[PDB]
Amino acid sequence: METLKITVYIVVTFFVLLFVFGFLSGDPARNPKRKDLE
Amino acid sequence: TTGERPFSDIITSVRYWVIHSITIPALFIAGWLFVSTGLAYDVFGTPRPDSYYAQEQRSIPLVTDRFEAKQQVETFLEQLK
Amino acid sequence: NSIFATNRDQESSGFAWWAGNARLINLSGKLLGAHVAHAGLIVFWAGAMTLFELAHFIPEKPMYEQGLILIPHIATLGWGVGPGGEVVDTFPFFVVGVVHLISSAVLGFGGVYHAIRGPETLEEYSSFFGYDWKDKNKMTTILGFHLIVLGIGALLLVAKAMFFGGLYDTWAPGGGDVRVITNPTLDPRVIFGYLLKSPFGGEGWIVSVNNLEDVVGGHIWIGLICIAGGIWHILTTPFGWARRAFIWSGEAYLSYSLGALSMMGFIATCFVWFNNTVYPSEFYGPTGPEASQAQAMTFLIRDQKLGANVGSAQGPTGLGKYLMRSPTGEIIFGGETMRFWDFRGPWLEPLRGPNGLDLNKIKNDIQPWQERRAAEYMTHAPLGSLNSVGGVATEINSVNFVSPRSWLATSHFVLAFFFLVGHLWHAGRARAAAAGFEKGIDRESEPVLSMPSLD
Amino acid sequence: ANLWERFCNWVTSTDNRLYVGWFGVIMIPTLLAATICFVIAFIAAPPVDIDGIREPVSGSLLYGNNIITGAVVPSSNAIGLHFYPIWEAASLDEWLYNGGPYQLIIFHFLLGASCYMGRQWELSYRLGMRPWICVAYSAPLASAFAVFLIYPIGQGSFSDGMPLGISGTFNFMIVFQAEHNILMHPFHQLGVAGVFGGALFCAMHGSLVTSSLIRETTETESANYGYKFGQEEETYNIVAAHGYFGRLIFQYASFNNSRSLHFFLAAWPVVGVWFAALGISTMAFNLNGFNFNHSVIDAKGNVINTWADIINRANLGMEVMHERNAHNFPLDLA
Amino acid sequence: RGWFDILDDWLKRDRFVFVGWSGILLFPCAYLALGGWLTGTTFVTSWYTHGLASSYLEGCNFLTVAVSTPANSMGHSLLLLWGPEAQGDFTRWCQLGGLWTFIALHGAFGLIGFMLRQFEIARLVGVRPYNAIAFSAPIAVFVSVFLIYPLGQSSWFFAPSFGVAAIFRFLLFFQGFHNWTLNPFHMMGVAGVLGGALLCAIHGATVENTLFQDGEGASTFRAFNPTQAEETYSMVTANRFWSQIFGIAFSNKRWLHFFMLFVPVTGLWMSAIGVVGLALNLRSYDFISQEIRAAEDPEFETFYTKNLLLNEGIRAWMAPQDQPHENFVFPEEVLPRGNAL
Amino acid sequence: AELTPEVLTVPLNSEGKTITLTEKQYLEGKRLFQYACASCHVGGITKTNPSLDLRTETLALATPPRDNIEGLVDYMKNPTTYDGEQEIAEVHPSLRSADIFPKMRNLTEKDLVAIAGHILVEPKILGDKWGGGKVYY
């Protein structure tokens, strides 16, 4: 169970970091019109 | 447009409100008096607060006979002393 | 001469009447007006409602029996009450109400002024009070002023608790009373420990705060954090990473605040439903868990008086009728209230030992005041109809009661929810508007038409 | 371009058959976990002690259920609102007895569905659309949050969350009526107007547009071939449609502005269902439906029953029977 | 030339309220049904039929007022004012529940009138009569629930009474006595209603969020013209969005709108069929395999058996007051109850 | 039916003496009962001990008898267990315990008589419903 817990924690952390860094990676610019929004 | 005068023209006119400052309060008051004189009870056969039961009974005057229903209700109404 | 002569129409603004307030986005003077006048409305309500409550208040009768939500807030701050939350003086309630109501005239005055008489835009009048939503430095500066203002407000709670009479403490030794807090918790491991705990059962995140020392110390931290952050924002401008992360516009900022207020609303809902420390049950009525626990206490007491050995009484299912174990072994009340074993309250804690409810204390030490309180709470459970018929849904008319906890939880859930909807609406719109397609697709330049087919 | 840049480009790509996106990076694993656990549990899970009284309820197909009676059964009342992941159990056998699958499924589902909503915003932004489809979806989403999370919170237990099954749903509904008189609550009433109205307006709109399709086909072919995907011109005569509906009621009850019409189609069911969700979410804190029990009294003081009192008798029947072994004390307080 | 054609001309004139031949049936029947309901809920009792107060006059509110069904002893009497029960006495007629048959029958003919109006107007304007066709669903529902159902039961007494709370009672009765939630015909009905509301919402939202920019206003409603030839929103963009979000999408607007007709209409029709079965107590009450297992095995429990215990509660607790003509007396000791409650 | 003087005539004591309550007295008693008692005694039952109700026959068999005005007034000043054996002011609302039960604090002799009057009159109106619980709702 300890191994399962750690495995899930790492998995969840991995995807959450994808979400956060993903939306930090110039998201307003990812549209088909006005890109320079900073 | 359908040929009649627009509602917005009618309900913003002096003629309309002259007519309806009489008729609206009159209908409203007639309704009030239909109830306040107790006529509403008599027309519809609705029990007044003192007409659901005779003094001691706790049994509902339920109609149990299709064709003598008229008489049964009449009997129930007599039993209200 | 014309009805379209002003800028206050769809023809000039691009917004219909039902979106009328959107005409104010770049009219900083009238917008200031709207905001100050609105703040007036909030203050007016705090004032008028308190006086309404007081006029209707029978001081010896419990507050929670009287549809009060504001007097309980004032009482929790230590004003007007003594031991057990008894009302000793209604005048502090009168003062709070009057002063809010008088202050609302001033805000209302200034709001009306700025909205219809004062300068429509502030930029040509003053570069200090004027602003451009897109001016990132000016935005963080005003944010900064307000952060300092909020920091101060938090320190005012601290001041009240520490120097100006204290706060109502339901946990006060020997019974609930107003207590001066002399040793606020400053240890960041305790304070930020709350922020890191699970929101789930038996943990409850910040809603679990259970002593005034933690509450007061938390506000010392919040006060200083907010003041430091206020200074930070007046002295800095947003870093590159932040510039590229956000949308920079009035509507975007509105949307961020909407998401924040939604979150806070949901938090407040849970706070008033579960917490009996900053929402004392003396003032707000028992929590749902509390009243459920209180029922079990009540029948444990009655049946034990009759000769029942409550520790050994086996219920129909095999579990103890009065007492059982939690999943980690603590002795807890039985029946459906098994779910509520995380409940903690001053009437119950004296019966608690290291392993949970203590059979010897239950047999020997239950005081008449505990019996009274459990009975009171069991019969004031936060259940009732919309028309304020107290009790279960099948209860007959007789008792005029809905718990303040229910009024406050339901209202704030509804508000938190619509505020999330508002956040989505304005966040989506702000994105669309910044990118330039909030009004629809350019027929001559339809983006999907330049994309390859999916299949 | 570095590896992270390429990854971000693929994630947010408008050319993927199914859009991924950042909300999708959370949505995909959470929905797959919920779905897989749901399917395995619905087929093969052993009985679950939902009410914490050591009286296990069988939900799965292999343990004697059909499609209609089967469910993933809520976690134990002994658990309450405690977080019960697999790793908090001594064994899978314990986790199963206590209704662990239910927690795993509902939490992954709620997170996944919340991200489904974000994903709808996200793709709209990538495609240069207006942003509010996600706002419409917030209505059913809010309703799911109400029955799986908010109700459990208010009542103190996930054992009171809606079961993941057809008969389990009906159970939830009947108990809810007994305990909240939901029928007599104006927010549920708004919900009904929302869904009856939604279905009415769905049928109405569908019938009116169908009624006014421009002739483009012969009798030996489907009228649907008269419209070609992506054509510029409208496929029906809205003037004819309006001319019919305006005469059916009266001219001004009929929409002539298609934008106004389609906004109304969005708003009516969405607003009604937001209220439905708020009904459940506020009844979660026991502010219940109207109670007119014994509201009508005669001159002597005799109770004169109304239909509300008859409803109350039905509610009592539900109340006294539900969870027949769980209550030891006279009042059902959660 | 000729009175019929002259009458036809006048009936079909384009006025604010279209009349038509259909109006001769529709207007009086709809008016009397609505007026019957307002009159009964305002002034009329249910004391002699049900032992119930049912009007504002007696102290009921909007939620509790009703026009109640006649007593069970009336059977399926038409209960005409001049019939052998009321014998032309208006007051007695009201007290016997005559307004219930009044509203049901005038309401039925009014519905016929409305659907004829849908046909009449469609023919005159020159559109296909799909709106009338769609209206067959409300008609199937009304007829099955307010006519067929009580006609299979003992009397009109068991039809729905016309009232908010009264209708709620009808729902709960169907749960406790018919196990109506278990019925797959009701389930299809639920699917059509919820699916219809879903389609309504999703289509409305989709159009409103794939609009072309056809004006400079931030409020986008003005930028539409009733006579414009062009689609106001992008079908192509809508299709891509849903294909990528959900996996499938409409590509054909005509199919889309026909499907919007099909779903809620079919759903209502299915629920009507189930109610026709319930007229005869032909319920989906039980699963036999479940009952055989449960009877032999006192540890076997499902949500299905849990719901039947609730139903048994409903029947025993509601029956004596809900069915006063039966004169049920259930001693306290025979009432099914779990522990404590 | 109506609320007659006959209905409002209840035993004043155990010796056969009665008082006729005024309509006003009854309504005040009902109001005060709701105010101070119904949280536990709604409809004639007792929520914190359902074994003891407020039915006339039950009050008649209490010690001392409680099926009359004077017995009920005495109960409201100095409540006892059903056998008369223990004084229960400390856990039951009374004038004697108006300090810990504040809703009792300003009740006069006329107030208690009114409450007592309501308790004896209710069953004469409601029958089995009074003290009957949910079965009779």
Ligand code: CLA
């Ligand atoms: C909190 C609520 C609130 C507030 C503070 C405002 C504020 C404002 N709105 Mg918005 N609005 C609101 C809600 C609100 N609105 C709602 C609910 C709708 C939909 C009906 C609208 C629709 C709308 C539209 C379409 C427009 C506005 C506009 C405006 C601004 C100019 C109004 C004007 O020119 O007055 C002219 C009216 C008067 C002079 C009549 C008197 C009004 C005063 C303020 C009443 C004061 C009463 C008070 C009791 C006085 C006591 C004072 C005492 C303290 C001494 C103003 C800042 C306009 C705008 O944006 O300007 C550029 C605009 O076009 N509003």
Ligand code: CLA
């Ligand atoms: C946080 C908000 C809040 C809360 C929790 C309460 C709670 C309470 N109030 Mg107070 N009050 C408030 C704000 C609030 N009020 C406001 C804004 C006013 C000005 C009208 C008042 C004025 C007031 C008076 C005069 C009284 C109370 C009283 C009461 C009590 C009885 C409530 C009742 O019976 O409601 C009945 C329930 C309703 C009327 C239902 C409201 C439903 C609304 C209309 C729907 C809201 C949905 C949402 C916001 C709409 C969004 C639409 C969407 C499409 C965008 C209760 C303690 C009474 C009391 O006991 O005083 C001692 C009393 O006499 N309140």
Ligand code: CLA
């Ligand atoms: C958000 C609040 C707010 C803000 C930012 C402004 C901003 C402005 N006001 Mg407006 N006003 C307000 C609210 C506000 N007002 C209120 C509540 C009233 C009613 C009293 C007014 C009545 C008013 C009038 C009649 C006029 C203005 C004017 C001005 C302008 C110049 C003011 C100045 O010279 O400052 C310098 C002022 C000081 C240095 C003194 C400040 C001392 C304050 C009062 C005490 C500080 C304590 C604390 C922060 C108060 C917190 C209160 C809180 C609890 C609510 C500027 C655009 C003028 C204008 O627009 O010119 C055409 C003008 O004629 N205001």
Ligand code: CLA
């Ligand atoms: C109303 C309050 C408020 C607002 C609106 C802002 C707004 C801003 N701040 Mg300031 N800040 C504040 C208060 C506020 N601040 C206070 C009180 C302090 C003192 C501590 C600071 C100290 C501060 C610093 C040092 C910085 C900012 C920065 C910024 C900017 C970007 C922030 C950001 O990206 O957040 C979004 C957050 C992230 C992108 C990080 C991820 C956060 C995780 C994923 C969320 C976890 C929270 C969870 C959901 C719930 C909480 C519980 C949790 C503990 C478990 C933005 C202008 C930055 C800036 O540009 O300054 C010039 C910056 O460097 N702020």
Ligand code: CLA
């Ligand atoms: C089209 C309009 C319309 C329709 C369809 C109905 C329909 C109905 N009414 Mg309503 N009614 C209406 C308008 C209408 N009403 C209006 C305007 C009023 C206010 C005056 C009323 C007031 C009213 C009351 C008070 C009642 C009804 C009732 C009824 C029901 C029974 C009627 C009956 O038995 O008639 C029988 C008569 C006919 C069907 C007419 C037949 C005429 C034939 C065709 C003549 C035959 C001529 C022949 C061809 C000649 C051959 C010659 C040869 C011998 C050589 C039925 C549902 C009753 C009901 O609802 O009870 C519950 C009831 O009590 N109605």
Ligand SMILES: CCCCCCCCCCCCCCCC(=O)OC[C@H](COP(=O)(O)OC[C@@H](O)CO)OC(=O)CCCCCCCCCCCCCCC
């Ligand atoms: C201001 C009203 C408060 C919002 C309430 C929620 C209703 C509107 C949102 C529904 C979401 C549907 C999904 C998206 C559908 C969608 O995409 O809509 C799009 C539609 C048109 O978009 P536009 O871009 O033209 O306008 C919105 C902004 O850009 C401002 O111009 O938005 C509106 O019409 C907003 C109208 C608000 C004005 C009032 C709305 C009426 C509701 C009032 C509440 C009364 C009911 C209470 C009684 C029970």
Ligand SMILES: CC1=C(/C=C/C(C)=C/C=C/C(C)=C/C=C/C=C(C)/C=C/C=C(C)/C=C/C2=C(C)CCCC2(C)C)C(C)(C)CCC1
């Ligand atoms: C802009 C605008 C608006 C708004 C407005 C506002 C929101 C405002 C306000 C306002 C306000 C917010 C106000 C106010 C006020 C107040 C006052 C005026 C006061 C006062 C007071 C007093 C007089 C007092 C007294 C007393 C005392 C001292 C004691 C006890 C008793 C008494 C109570 C008697 C609107 C929507 C229309 C629209 C258009 C624009």
Ligand SMILES: CC1=C(/C=C/C(C)=C/C=C/C(C)=C/C=C/C=C(C)/C=C/C=C(C)/C=C/C2=C(C)CCCC2(C)C)C(C)(C)CCC1
């Ligand atoms: C007073 C008090 C206290 C305390 C408190 C505290 C100390 C606090 C806090 C707090 C805090 C410290 C907080 C917070 C927060 C945060 C947040 C809420 C966040 C956020 C974020 C966001 C929203 C983001 C977003 C995003 C992303 C994710 C990525 C990209 C993009 C964006 C940017 C959009 C206590 C409990 C002891 C007790 C009682 C009282």
Ligand SMILES: CC1=C(/C=C/C(C)=C/C=C/C(C)=C/C=C/C=C(C)/C=C/C=C(C)/C=C/C2=C(C)CCCC2(C)C)C(C)(C)CCC1
């Ligand atoms: C039965 C009958 C008849 C008849 C009758 C009629 C035709 C009547 C009528 C009637 C009517 C025609 C009535 C009425 C009425 C009404 C009312 C009573 C009303 C009301 C209302 C209201 C109260 C309102 C409200 C509301 C709503 C709805 C919603 C929104 C808001 C509000 C809140 C505004 C005849 C002689 C043939 C014969 C025998 C029997």
Ligand code: OEX
């Ligand atoms: O777990 Mn499911 O159902 Ca809510 O109330 Mn208490 O807990 Mn049980 O009883 Mn009734």
Ligand SMILES: [Ca+2]
């Ligand atoms: Ca203009």
Ligand SMILES: [Cl-]
């Ligand atoms: Cl229990």
Ligand SMILES: [Cl-]
């Ligand atoms: Cl159950």
Ligand SMILES: [Fe+2]
């Ligand atoms: Fe459409």
